[PDB]
Design a protein around this ligand. Structure first.
Ligand SMILES: Nc1ncnc2c1ncn2[C@@H]1O[C@H](COP(=O)(O)OP(=O)(O)O)[C@@H](O)[C@H]1O
Ligand SMILES: Nc1ncnc2c1ncn2[C@@H]1O[C@H](COP(=O)(O)O)[C@@H](O)[C@H]1O
Ligand SMILES: [Mg+2]
Lengths: 547, 539
C-alpha cells in the first residue's frame, strides 16, 4: 500500500516545487535592475521568504485529506523517513529536500515529535563532500595581457545589456586597489552574479602567489539611468561585512547551493556552513544547520545556559552560553489570567523583519515552535525566571523542559555595556554608528520606537545593530511633533534619555545635530512615500570612489 | 468556500514545477555524463527525463481524486477549478507548459467531455528577462573569435590541438561567404549547448547582413577525451536534420522554453512551434500545439480525411489529408503489444531512422471531413471501440507521426542517381538500427518512407525488437540471405544493392555486429551527410 510513499512523493514535490519558484524569483533580478522597478526589488525577498511555507502549508494540508486510517503512529511515520530517503541518492539538492520534510513534521506535530529518527536533523549518508558541482559554477580567467585587458572580459561577457557609463574609466580605477600589493595570480570571476538591492555583485577570488584572497566587483547605476561599477573590495574584512548577518541575503540563481556554499567558503573564511546558506537565500536550511552546529557546541563544552548580558527586558526572556555566538529570545506570559490567543504583535515585528530590508542595523532570527531544552544544562537561576516569567509557555518534560516559539539571533555585545567600556577615539564611533543606525533605520521604513542605548548591539569591528522588535512600526505609522494622542512621536523628547551621560550626550552634537529635531523626521518618512528609499552601501561612505 | 477550489488548482500547479525543475536537474546533468563519457546513462537520462511528466500527472491524480473524497469528478467544479488556474498563471514564465500540464491531468482522471470550456489545450489559451545568448564581433579576427566564444564553455576535459579548428571553421565560412563578406559579419551564440547522444553541440546564429543565417558546430571526442568540432553547419537545410523529427530528444537547459523556442526560430524558418518545442523534449506542449495546428489547419480547408497512400498495412490503419504533413495512426484491433512496442522506439534513441509519435486514447474528428470510402474502413476494421455520435466520433488509443512519402512508391517515381541516391540510404537505414540495438522484423520498402531532404526512416516498429533477442544463423530466428528475395526483386532496383549493401545479406555483419553492443558500444549515428566531417575530404 503506497500509503506512506504517496506521502513521501508528496512532501518531496512540495520541496521540488518550493524550490521551483525559488529560482524563477531569484532570476528576475537582472531585468528588474535594467527595468526600473525597485518597488519590485524590495518586494521579491518578500516573495522568496513565503514560498517555502507556501509549499509546506499545502503538502501539510493535502496530507490530511487522506491521513485518517492509520494517520499517525510513529510506526509508519518512519516508513516516510525511509521511503523518502531511499528516493534521494542522486538528489544533489537533497540537504534541502530533507529540510523541507522537517518543518512539515514539526507543523503536523507541534514542532514536537521525538528525536533523531523521527526527522532529518542531520544529513543522511551522502553526506559529507559537497563536491556536488557537475558544472564549473564559475570560470577560470587567467592573466595573459593581465589587468587592463583581462578584466575587460568580465565587463564584456556580462549578460548585462545597457550602455555602460565608463568601463574604460573603471579599468583605470581598479588597478589602484590591485597595487596595494600580480599577474602571477589568475582570476576566477563567478557565475552567476550576486544580486542584492540597488546593486549587483560580481563575485570572485583573486589567487595570488603569496596567498589567495576575495575580489568583489559591485555594479551600480545613476538612478534612473547610467551605471558604474564601484569600489573594488578584496579583503576578508570586507567579504564578511557585505555578506553580513545585519543585511539581507542574496539573489544568486543557484539550483545547487550546497556546492556554491563551497566556492565562497574561501571568500568568507570565518563564516559558518549555516551563514552561507543564509546568504544565497536558503535560510530555511541555515536553520536545520545553525541548530546542527549549535547542538555540537554544548554537546561538547562547558558549561550551561545563562541569562544574557545587559538589561533585562520588559517583554523578552534572553539566554545564551558564555562561549556561544547566539542568543535565544523567549517571550513572557505577563500573568496567569492573561491568555495567549494569538496574532502576536511581537511575533509580527519579528516576522515583519523576516521580510524587511535590514541594511546592517537589524539582525535576523530563527523560529522553532517547541524546543526541547536540557534540564541538566539549565542553571537553577535562569530556570526560576524562565519557569515563572514564562510558565504558560513551557512544560516540564521529565528530564527536559519544553519551550514554545523561541527566537535565535547572533549574540552581540549590548551597546550600553560597551558604551561604558570605551572612551576616547573609540567613544567617537559608538555614537556615530548609533545615529547612523537611526538615520538608516528611518530610511528603511524603520522607526525604532524605544530607541534607548541597550537595544542595539555591536560587532568586533564596531558597529550598531538594533534587536528590539516590539516598539517597531513603519515610518508612515507615526506622526512627528513635540511642540507645546496615541501613537504619536515627539522627536526632541529624545533629548532627555539619550544625552543623559555627560560624556556622550555632548558628543551627540558632533555627529547628530538634527535627530533631536522634529522637522528632519517628516523628511525621511515623507521621502519614503514619494516612492524613494535610499538603499545601502556595503562599505564605509569613505571608501566610495565618489569621495 | 472551504473546499477544493483553491486546494485543487494549486495541487495541480505544484506537480507541475515539482516536475519541470527536476526536468532541468537532469537536462543539465547531461554535460557531466557526456563529459564523463558515461554514455550508457546518456541513454537512461533520455528514459528518465521522458518519465517525469507522466509521473507527476499520475501523482496529482492520486492526490487529486483522494483530496475530493470518493468517486465523482464534476464539470462545473472542473470550470470552478479552472477559473482559479489562470489567475495564478500571470507571473508565470513557463506558464505555457502549465496550461499543457493541466490537460494531461483531465485526461488522466478517459478524457470524457473533453473541452473547450474545461481545459486550455493550445498555443497559449490567451523583453527577455535574462541572459539568453551572447554576441561576438570580428573586430580582432575570426581566428581569435573562435577561441573567445569557446573559453566561455563549461567543458573541463582538455582540448587537444584546438589550433586546427579555428582555422578549419573559417573555410566553410570563407568559400561560402567570401573573405570580403566576413569582415563585418558577427555571431549570436546560445549560452547553453544542445546535448544529444554522443554530442555537445554549439548552437548559435551567424549574422551576415547578407541575410540572417544559421551556424552549427557539433562537439565530438572519442575514447580518451580529445575534443574538436565535427563539421560546421551553416545553410538553412542542415538545421532541419539536426533538429529533425526522426531524432532523439534534445538536451538544453532553459528554465524558459518560450524564449528558447522563440530564439531558435529564424535559424531554419522551417515550419512550426510543436516541432520547435519538441526539439527540446517539451513534446507535451507539442502534444498540445499540434492540437492547435490540428485545429487551425482545417478551418479554411475544403479537404476531407483519407487513407495515407502506400500498400495498405497489415500493421495499422492510417488516415490523413491532401496537404496535411502528419499522418494518423489508429492501431488495428483484432489483427496490446503495440501499446508497448510502439513506445520502445518512443523510449529509444530514435536514430532519424524512426518516427516520433504521440498518443491519444480518446480523440475527436468531425465526421463531415470523413469520406465513407474511409468510414467503413474505420467503422469496421477499427471498430473494437467505435463511438459514433450523430455527427462526430471519438477514436481510442491513436498515435501520430509526420507523414513522409512511402519508399516502395518512392522507388518508381525514381531512376537515375535518384535511385543510387535513395537505395544507399535505405541500407544505411537498416544498418543504423542494429547499431542502435533495433531489429526490423518486417523490413520492407512498404514500411519505410522518405523525408523532405530525401531520407528513409523506419515507421514500422510493429514487429520490432532489440537485436538482443534474435539469432541470425548461418547456412526470433532470421535468415538475412532470403531478404534479397524480397529485397532484390526488381531488375532496376536490386543490383545497386549488391554493389553497396551486400553485407546486409551475409549473417556475418548481422551476428558479428551484435557482439559490438553487448560489449558496451554506443553507435556513432551522425546528423550530417557523412562527407561533411572536417577530417574527411578536408585535410
Ligand atoms: N542579540 C542580542 N545581543 C545581546 N543581547 C541581547 C540580544 N537580544 C536580547 N539581548 C538581551 O536581552 C534583552 C532583551 O532585549 P529586547 O530584545 O529589547 O527585549 P526587551 O524589549 O524586553 O528588552 C536585551 O536588553 C539584551 O540585553
Ligand atoms: N485524449 C486527449 N484529447 C485531447 N488532448 C489530449 C489527449 N491526450 C493528451 N492530450 C494533449 O497532449 C498533452 C499531453 O498529455 P498526456 O500525454 O495525456 O500526458 C495534454 O496536455 C493534452 O494537451
Ligand atoms: Mg532592551
Amino acid at each position: 500500500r503506497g500509503l506512506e510513499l504517496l506521502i513521501a512523493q508528496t512532501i518531496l514535490q512540495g520541496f521540488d516545487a518550493q524550490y521551483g519558484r525559488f529560482l524563477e524569483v531569484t532570476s528576475g533580478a537582472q531585468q528588474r535592475f535594467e527595468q526600473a522597478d525597485w518597488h519590485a526589488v524590495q518586494q521579491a525577498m518578500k516573495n522568496r521568504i513565503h514560498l517555502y511555507d507556501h509549499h509546506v502549508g499545502l503538502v501539510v494540508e493535502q496530507l490530511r485529506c487522506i491521513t485518517n486510517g492509520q494517520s499517525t503512529d510513529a510506526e509508519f511515520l518512519l516508513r516516510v523517513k525511509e521511503h523518502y530517503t531511499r528516493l534521494l541518492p542522486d538528489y544533489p539538492r537533497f540537504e534541502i529536500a530533507e529540510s523541507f520534510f522537517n518543518s512539515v513534521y514539526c507543523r503536523l506535530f507541534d514542532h514536537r515529535s521525538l528525536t533523531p529518527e523521527r526527522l532529518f536533523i542531520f544529513s543522511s549518508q551522502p553526506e559529507r563532500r559537497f563536491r556536488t558541482i557537475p558544472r564549473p559554477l564559475a570560470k577560470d580567467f587567467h592573466p595573459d595581457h593581465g589587468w587592463e585587458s583581462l578584466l575587460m572580459r568580465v565587463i564584456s561577457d556580462l549578460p548585462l545589456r545597457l550602455h555602460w557609463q565608463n568601463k574604460s574609466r573603471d579599468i583605470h580605477y581598479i588597478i589602484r586597489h590591485l597595487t596595494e600589493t600580480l599577474s602571477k595570480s589568475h582570476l576566477q570571476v563567478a557565475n552567476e552574479l550576486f544580486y542584492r538591492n540597488k546593486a549587483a555583485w560580481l563575485v570572485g577570488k583573486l589567487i595570488t602567489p603569496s596567498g589567495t584572497l576575495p575580489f568583489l566587483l559591485p555594479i551600480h547605476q545613476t538612478d534612473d539611468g547610467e551605471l558604474f561599477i564601484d569600489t573594488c573590495l578584496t579583503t576578508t574584512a570586507e567579504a564578511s561585512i557585505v555578506f553580513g548577518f545585519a543585511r539581507s541575503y542574496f539573489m544568486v540563481y543557484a539550483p545547487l547551493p550546497a556546492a556554491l556554499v563551497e566556492w565562497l567558503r574561501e571568500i568568507l573564511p570565518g563564516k559558518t556552513t549555516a551563514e552561507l546558506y543564509m546568504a544565497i537565500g536558503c535560510q530555511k536550511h541555515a536553520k536545520t544547520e545553525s541548530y546542527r552546529e549549535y547542538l555540537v557546541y554544548l554537546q561538547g563544552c562547558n558549561e550551561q545556559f545563562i541569562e544574557a548580558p545587559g538589561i533585562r527586558g520588559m517583554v523578552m526572556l534572553v539566554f545564551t552560553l558564555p562561549g556561544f555566538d547566539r542568543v535565544f529570545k523567549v517571550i513572557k506570559d505577563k500573568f496567569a489570567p492573561q491568555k495567549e490567543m494569538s496574532a502576536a504583535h511581537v511575533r509580527a515585528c519579528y516576522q515583519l523583519v523576516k521580510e524587511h530590508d535590514r541594511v546592517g542595523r537589524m539582525a535576523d532570527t530563527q523560529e522553532f515552535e517547541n524546543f526541547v531544552l536540557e534540564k541538566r544544562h539549565i542553571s537553577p537561576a535562569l530556570m526560576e525566571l524562565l519557569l515563572q516569567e514564562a510558565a504558560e509557555k513551557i512544560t516540564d518534560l521529565g528530564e527536559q523542559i519544553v519551550i514554545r516559539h523561541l527566537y535565535i539571533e547572533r549574540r552581540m555585545v549590548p551597546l550600553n555595556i560597551w558604551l561604558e567600556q570605551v572612551e576616547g577615539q573609540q567613544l567617537r564611533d559608538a555614537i556615530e554608528e548609533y545615529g547612523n543606525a537611526i538615520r538608516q533605520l528611518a530610511a528603511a521604513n524603520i522607526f525604532p520606537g524605544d530607541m534607548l542605548f541597550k537595544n542595539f548591539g555591536v560587532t568586533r569591528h564596531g558597529r550598531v545593530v538594533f534587536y528590539d522588535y516590539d516598539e517597531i512600526c513603519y515610518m508612515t505609522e507615526v506622526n512627528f511633533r513635540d511642540i507645546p494622542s496615541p501613537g504619536d512621536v515627539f522627536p526632541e523628547e529624545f533629548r532627555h534619555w539619550l544625552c543623559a551621560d555627560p560624556r556622550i550626550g555632548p558628543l551627540f552634537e558632533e555627529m547628530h545635530a538634527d535627530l533631536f529635531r522634529a522637522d528632519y523626521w517628516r523628511a525621511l518618512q515623507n521621502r519614503i512615500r514619494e516612492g524613494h528609499v535610499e538603499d545601502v552601501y556595503a562599505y564605509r561612505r569613505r571608501q566610495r570612489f565618489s569621495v
